[PDB]
Amino acid sequence: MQLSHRPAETGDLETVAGFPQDRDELFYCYPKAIWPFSVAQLAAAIAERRGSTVAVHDGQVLGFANFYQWQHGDFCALGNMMVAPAARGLGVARYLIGVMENLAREQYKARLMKISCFNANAAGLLLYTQLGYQPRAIAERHDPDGRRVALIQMDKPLE
């Protein structure tokens, strides 16, 4: 894979809004979004966030990430992290998380990255574990059916 990145652009949003492939994946990234996900909902999320970035390979937008929180000198919290359904398992998220860690260091002088992941998202938990994030706490949340779920809060020092 020859991946590159750049800031997200308007023309990328139609593609990116298609990355959650079912209500579970939608929930994992946008727990208050309504199915189907739409560009208006994605734009609304981006508006609240910083550092929206896309990963590109062979002319295709395959990954998207941003920051949910950013505290200069202190930490950033990874927000959205989504990969095109046809390109999973190929290292796109590993790549883009690395990019976002560099951006955290460079633009915010962060010394820590925080992530949180819903309990049902095994791929997400394993991703972050593989990248050296450690679990710190677990919080109760609710899904769109009002069922109780566990949000696993993790972090990693940035060097």
Ligand X SMILES: *SCCNC(=O)CCNC(=O)[C@H](O)C(C)(C)COP(=O)(O)OP(=O)(O)OC[C@H]1O[C@@H](n2cnc3c(N)ncnc32)[C@H](O)[C@@H]1OP(=O)(O)O
Per CB under 6 A, residues contacting ligand X are 20, 25, 28-29, 80-83, 88-94, 121-124, 126-127, 130
- Paired residues of 78 in beta bridges: 67
- Total number of residues shown for the chain: 159
How far is it, in rounded angstroms, from Cα 69 to Cα 132?
A: 20
- CB 73 to ligand X: min, Å: 25
Torsion of the alpha carbons at 69, 5, 133 and 68, rounded to the nearest 10: 10
- CB 98 to ligand X: min, Å: 10
Is 126 assigned to a binding site?
yes
- CB 33 to ligand X: min, Å: 11
Is 72 assigned to a binding site?
no
Geometric angle at alpha carbon 1, from 42 and 58, rounded to 5°: 60
Is 83 assigned to a binding site?
yes
| Cis omega (within 30 of 0) for bond into 20 | no
Is 140 assigned to a binding site?
yes
- CB 10 to ligand X: min, Å: 21
Is 93 assigned to a binding site?
yes
**8-11 long-range contacts, Cβ below 8 Å, gap at least 24?**
8/46, 8/52, 8/53, 8/54, 8/64, 8/66, 9/54
Q: Which residues are annotated as a binding site for acetyl-CoA?
A: 81, 83, 89, 91, 93-94, 121, 126
Q: Which residues are annotated as a binding site for Zn(2+)?
A: 5, 57, 140, 142
Q: Which residues are annotated as a binding site?
A: 5, 29, 57, 81, 83, 89, 91, 93-94, 121, 126, 130, 140, 142
